[PDB]
């Protein structure tokens, strides 16, 4: 769906900044800070679930650019690992939000952000 | 879910980005132009459904900024109405592409379009 390299960038970026908010809001539900409203959340990991799927098919070869290393290209199949494996942590993450089950939310969530920080680790240029 | 305005303003450039994208990457197909595919369309129109929920709570009071007209905040009600129609006429889409109806998708999609340009020419600062 991409004319040039550099409208898979603007989409990724979009897709990722997107997942980061939906991601990131519940960081205060988590902690306790906000309360904790299972309904919400099992409403909001619905839709980080959809988000969380898109951003890889922006990955295609021939679009490096922005601050995506070259080695997501170099080795295909791990780079797939790494995305299949953080989609399978957001699996754990909605299991937790739609049994209303807090204790498995706060395991689930720390579990994703170790999977986006071991992408990174690999595959962003910081 | 925004820190300050310009949090709001980034999430719902990137929402409505992703929708742009989601959206316009069905035109070859609704043109004849790409070959249809009843479940591809299915899925990628329920993907355009979850994204067109989103940008309008990052309009949220005191979120002026990008490219958005100040007209949003002075008549709350209407364009509260402009978003709602729009996201009915994606329902009409949704419908269409569930129901593997070709004709249908074709006249959804041109009337989904046209209440992108209706909401644009009241609300976006050309
Ligand atoms: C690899 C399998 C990744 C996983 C899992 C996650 N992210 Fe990531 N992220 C990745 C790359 C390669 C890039 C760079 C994209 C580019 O072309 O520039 C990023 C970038 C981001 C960004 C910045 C987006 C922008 O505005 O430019 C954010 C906010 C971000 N990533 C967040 C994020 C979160 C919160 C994740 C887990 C919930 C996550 N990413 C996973 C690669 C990968
Ligand atoms: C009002 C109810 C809108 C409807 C319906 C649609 N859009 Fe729009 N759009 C709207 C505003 C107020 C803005 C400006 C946001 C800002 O703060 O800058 C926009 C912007 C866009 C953009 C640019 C995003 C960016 O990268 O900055 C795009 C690509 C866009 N809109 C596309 C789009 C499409 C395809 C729509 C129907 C499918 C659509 N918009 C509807 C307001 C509204």
Not at 12 to 35: D, E, Y
Not at 42 to 59: D, I, Q
Not at 63 to 75: F, K, L, M, V
Not at 90 to 104: E, F, H, N, T
């Amino acid at each position: 769906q991409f004319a040039k390299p550099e409208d898979a960038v603007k989409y990724r970026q979009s897709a990722l900044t997107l997942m980061a908010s939906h991601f990131g809001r519940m960081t205060p539900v988590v902690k306790g800070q906000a309360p904790y409203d299972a309904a919400q959340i099992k409403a909001n990991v619905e839709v980080l679930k959809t988000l969380s799927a898109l951003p890889w098919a922006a990955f295609g070869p021939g679009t490096e650019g922005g601050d995506a290393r070259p080695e997501i290209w170099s080795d295909a199949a791990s780079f797939k690992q790494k995305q299949q494996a953080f989609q399978d942590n957001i699996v754990k993450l909605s299991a937790a939000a739609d049994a209303g089950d807090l204790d498995k939310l706060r395991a689930a969530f720390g579990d994703v952000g170790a999977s986006c920080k071991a992408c990174h680790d690999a595959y962003f240029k910081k």
